[PDB]
């Protein structure tokens, strides 16, 4: 039961308090998060250990226990929901129409929502509840607000 | 360092939700270390 489906906080502790460094998705026995959350290191889940399996620093993604399982794609048209899991706050659904990161290799959906750094890895959902990507790799625009790519791996 | 995970909820679409944020159209580049930058 250390890999039951759901969204999870990623925490670190030393000798004192804990810090939320990110968020991830457990699906089909595999944990999915952003590379900058864990730096690709192993995770504890209760009494168990989750070992890194696949990852890519350029995509800023890592999976644990098996290959990347999340395959749903933004349809380029519809509103989406960020299931934001900020440090010290309950999970909340935020609906938005993505903008676009236009790159030399193609377009990527992008959400203009601002949260603390430890919200990295929060899942972005389509209307069927499928995870179409993870929040937290993006840019800061002129006024200081944030735009996150909808970062999705290849299944 | 103890890096560990804690369950935080079910993954479910919320019917009738607050729709918010704008939809910016940005030109960006992605480098080999995973950093996005404005172009």
């Amino acid at each position: 039961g250390e890999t039951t489906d759901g969204v999870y906080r990623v925490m670190t502790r030393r000798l004192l308090g804990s810090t939320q460094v990110g968020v991830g998705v457990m699906q089909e026995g595999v944990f999915h998060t952003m590379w900058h959350v864990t730096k690709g290191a192993a995770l504890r889940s209760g009494e168990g250990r989750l070992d890194p399996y696949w990852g890519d620093v350029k995509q800023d993604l890592v999976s644990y226990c098996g290959p990347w399982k999340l395959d749903a794609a933004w349809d380029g048209l519809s509103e989406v929901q960020l299931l934001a899991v900020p440090p010290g706050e309950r999970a909340k659904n935020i609906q938005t129409l993505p903008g676009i990161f236009k790159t030399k290799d193609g377009d990527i959906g992008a959400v203009a929502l601002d949260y603390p750094a430890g919200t990295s890895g929060s899942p972005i959902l389509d209307k069927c509840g499928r995870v179409i990507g993870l929040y937290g790799n993006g840019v800061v625009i002129k006024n200081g607000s944030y735009v996150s790519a909808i970062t999705q791996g290849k299944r | 360092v103890d890096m560990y995970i804690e369950r935080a909820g079910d993954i479910t679409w919320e019917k009738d939700a607050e729709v918010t944020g704008n939809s910016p159209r940005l030109d960006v580049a992605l480098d080999e270390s995973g950093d996005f930058s404005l172009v």
């Binding site: 900058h36 601002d114 750094a117 790799n137 | -």
Partner: peptide
Amino acid sequence: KXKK
């Protein structure tokens, strides 16, 4: 971002 409270870019990451």
